Amino acid sequence: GATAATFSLSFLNSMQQNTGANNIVATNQNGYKPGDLVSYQINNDGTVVGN
Amino acid sequence: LDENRNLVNMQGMQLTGYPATGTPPTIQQGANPAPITIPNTLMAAKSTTTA
Amino acid sequence: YSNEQEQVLGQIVLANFANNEGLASQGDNVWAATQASGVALLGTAGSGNF
Incomplete structure (x- = not known):
């Protein structure tokens, strides 16, 4: 019953210079399972932050 | 790094200098520190130009 | 194997970071990926930067 994944994949800065064999160099996305507070810390700008 | x-x-203070631009990239003194x-x-x- | 036939059963994957010395030591001889270390950036022992 969970929804799908609407991802706009972008292959920016891709080149074909006969660079040996095809391979990946960078990959990132913006999804995650929910997480629980493990630790926390304070930064000297004022803002606390939990990890 | x-x-x-x-x-x-060691603290978080980024190091700056003259950026190099062009192809082949080369330094330029007319740019502010970056x-x-x-x-x-x-x-x-x-491409090959001579042999 | 018995009949003089080879079988490949997997390849060990190596990891390289955009920045070392950000790794957190975790007791025994091992480090943990974290901030100030970058993403895993897996690969193979053959070529690349490994």
Whole structure:
């Protein structure tokens, strides 16, 4: 019953210079399972932050 | 170094200098100091001009 | 194997970071990926930067 994944994949800065064999160099996305507070810390700008 | 591949001291103070631009890239003194970074880009090729 | 036939059963994957010395030591001879270390950036022992 969970929804799908609407991802706009972008292959920016891709080149074909006969660079040996095809391979990946960078990959990132913006999804995650929910997480629980493990630790926390304070930064000297004022803002606390939990990890 | 760091995640952004910018030169930085032990505290978080980014290191700056003249950025190099062009192809072949070369320094220029007419640009203001910029945060130096060692990129992860794949250097482009160049056609043969003589032999 | 018995009949003089080879079988490949997997390849060990190596990891390289955009920045070392950000790794957190975790007791025994091992480090943990975290901030100030970058993403895993897996690969193979053959070529690349490994």
